[PDB]
Amino acid sequence: SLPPVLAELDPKGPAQAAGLKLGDRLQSIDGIAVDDWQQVVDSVRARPGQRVQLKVLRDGEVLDVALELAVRGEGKARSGYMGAGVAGTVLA
Amino acid sequence: SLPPVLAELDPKGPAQAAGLKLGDRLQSIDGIAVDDWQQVVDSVRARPGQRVQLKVLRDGEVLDVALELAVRGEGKARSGYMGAGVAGTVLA
Numbered sequence: 525s526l527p528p529v530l531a532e533l534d535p536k537g538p539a540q541a542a543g544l545k546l547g548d549r550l551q552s553i554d555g556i557a558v559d560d561w562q563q564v565v566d567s568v569r570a571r572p573g574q575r576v577q578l579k580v581l582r583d584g585e586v587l588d589v590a591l592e593l594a595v596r597g598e599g600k601a602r603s604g605y606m607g608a609g610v611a612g613t614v615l616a
Numbered sequence: 617s618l619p620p621v622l623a624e625l626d627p628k629g630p631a632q633a634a635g636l637k638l639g640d641r642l643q644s645i646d647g648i649a650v651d652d653w654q655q656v657v658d659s660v661r662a663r664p665g666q667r668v669q670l671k672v673l674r675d676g677e678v679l680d681v682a683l684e685l686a687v688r689g690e691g692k693a694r695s696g697y698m699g700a701g702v703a704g705t706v707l708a
Contacts (some may be wrong), residue, residue: 542680555667575647577669578680588634590669590682597659 525560530608532615537607542591544580544608551579551586552573561610567615568593576606623694624707629699632666634683636672636700641672643678653702660685660708661695668698 528550532539536612550558553567554577568576572595580589609615620642634680642645642650660668664687674680683699685696701707 575669575680577667577670579667588667588682588684590680592680 525613526562526610526612528558528561528564529610529613532609533608537605538591538594539606539608542589542592544578544589547582549581551581553578561614561616564606565616568606572602572604574604577588617652618702618704618706620650620653621702623703624701626699630683630686631698631700636670636679636681636683637674639674640690641673643673644680645670653706653708656698657708660698664696666696675698 530539530544530546530548532549533544533546550564552558553564558564571593574593576593577592578589578591580587591606593606595602596605597603606616622631622636622638622640622642625636626640642656644650645656650656664686666685668683668685670681670683672679683698685698687694688697689695698708
């Protein structure tokens with residue numbers, strides 16, 4: 525259960541465009557508390573093109589972040605994409 | 617029908633905290649196109665405490681904005697509040 529703390533960002537992805545930063549902790553997605561990183565991955569992958577709203581903890585302050593998920597892959601593999609990852613080898 | 621173009625902001629309100637700015641045009645709320653300012657007023661007033669996601673046009677660029685609506689009033693008058701208004705005398 526990996527903590528949902530951002531360690532990488534795609535410079536051309538939705539997450540950076542939305543104002544997310546390395547070190548941010550994702551607290552909720554569309555009002556649903558985030559348990560771990562896999563929950564984010566699963567939710568993002570299922571939602572190509574969708575608006576999503578986040579509660580984010582940054583340096584002790586809670587902020588609201590909005591983004592529109594992009595799309596990667598084709599056919600069965602076509603998925604939502606946020607352009608953010610956690611430590612290790614972990615990408616959403 | 618008043619265009620949903622921000623002309624005033626409460627410095628302690630959710631809108632300024634969310635990164636909204638004077639001159640911003642509200643294009644959608646929670647995925648629903650904004651027709652006019654009264655639609656914003658009506659939607660905000662109905663949603664005390666609620667997360668809302670906006671599409672916003674700022675100087676030709678569309679961005680995604682998230683906020684949590686605050687609360688004002690008491691009893692029957694208790695309503696959601698965003699802390700933004702349009703030109704004239706108009707506030708949401």
